[PDB]
Amino acid sequence: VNSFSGYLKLTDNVYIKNADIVEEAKKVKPTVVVNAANVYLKHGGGVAGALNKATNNAMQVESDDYIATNGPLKVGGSCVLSGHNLAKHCLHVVGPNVNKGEDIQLLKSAYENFNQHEVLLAPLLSAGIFGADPIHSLRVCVDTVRTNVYLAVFDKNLYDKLVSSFL
Numbered sequence: 093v094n095s096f097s098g099y100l101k102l103t104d105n106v107y108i109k110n111a112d113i114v115e116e117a118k119k120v121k122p123t124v125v126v127n128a129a130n131v132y133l134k135h136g137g138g139v140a141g142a143l144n145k146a147t148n149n150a151m152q153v154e155s156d157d158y159i160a161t162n163g164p165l166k167v168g169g170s171c172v173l174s175g176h177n178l179a180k181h182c183l184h185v186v187g188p189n190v191n192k193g194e195d196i197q198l199l200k201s202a203y204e205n206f207n208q209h210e211v212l213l214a215p216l217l218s219a220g221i222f223g224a225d226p227i228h229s230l231r232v233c234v235d236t237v238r239t240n241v242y243l244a245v246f247d248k249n250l251y252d253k254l255v256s257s258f259l
C-alpha cells in the first residue's frame with residue numbers, strides 16, 4: 093500500500109489521474125518524481141518548467157552544476173538528482189522531442205529508465221510540447237514499464253481521451 097489517491101488502475105502496474113504533476117508531488121512527496129527533461133537539463137516549460145518553478149529554481153541550479161561536470165544527457169537517457177521540496181529524488185528522463193526531429197523509437201528506451209525505480213510519479217514522455225501522440229506514449233509506457241507508475245496528466249480533456257481509448 094502507498095499514498096497515491098484517486099488514481100485509476102489501467103494495468104497490474106500502471107495507474108493514471110488528471111492532475112498537475114507538481115501539485116501531486118507537493119501532496120504525496122513520492123520517493124521519485126519523473127521530470128520530462130531535455131539533454132541540457134534546461135527546465136523552461138511544460139512539466140520541467142513547472143517542476144523547476146515549484147523548487148524556486150533550485151532544480152535548475154543543481155542541473156547546471158550536473159551538466160558542467162558531466163555534459164549533456166542522451167536522448168532516451170536519464171539522471172537521478174534531488175527532488176528538492178517535491179520528492180526525495182527527481183529522475184530526469186529525456187524522451188525524444190518530435191518538434192526537434194528526434195527518433196520516436198527512442199521513447200521505449202526513455203521509459204526503460206523507470207524500471208530502475210520501484211515506484212514513480214511520472215508524466216507521459218514525449219507528449220505535450222515534445223510533439224508525440226499521448227495515446228502512443230501511454231501504450232509504450234504500459235508495454236515497457238514493469239515497476240509501479242502513477243501517471244499524472246495535466247489536460248483534463250486529454251485524460252478523458254486517454255482513458256476512453258485505452259486498450
Ligand SMILES: O=C(N[C@@H]1c2cccc(O)c2C[C@@H]1C(=O)O)c1ccc2[nH]c(CO)nc2c1
Nearest residue numbers: 112113138139142215216219220245246247250
Ligand atoms: O506541459 C505539461 N504537461 C504536458 C501537457 C500539457 C498540456 C497539454 C498536454 O497534452 C500535455 C502532455 C504533457 C502531460 O500531461 O504530461 C505541464 C504539466 C504541469 C504543469 N503545471 C503548469 C503550471 O502552469 N504547467 C504545466 C504543464
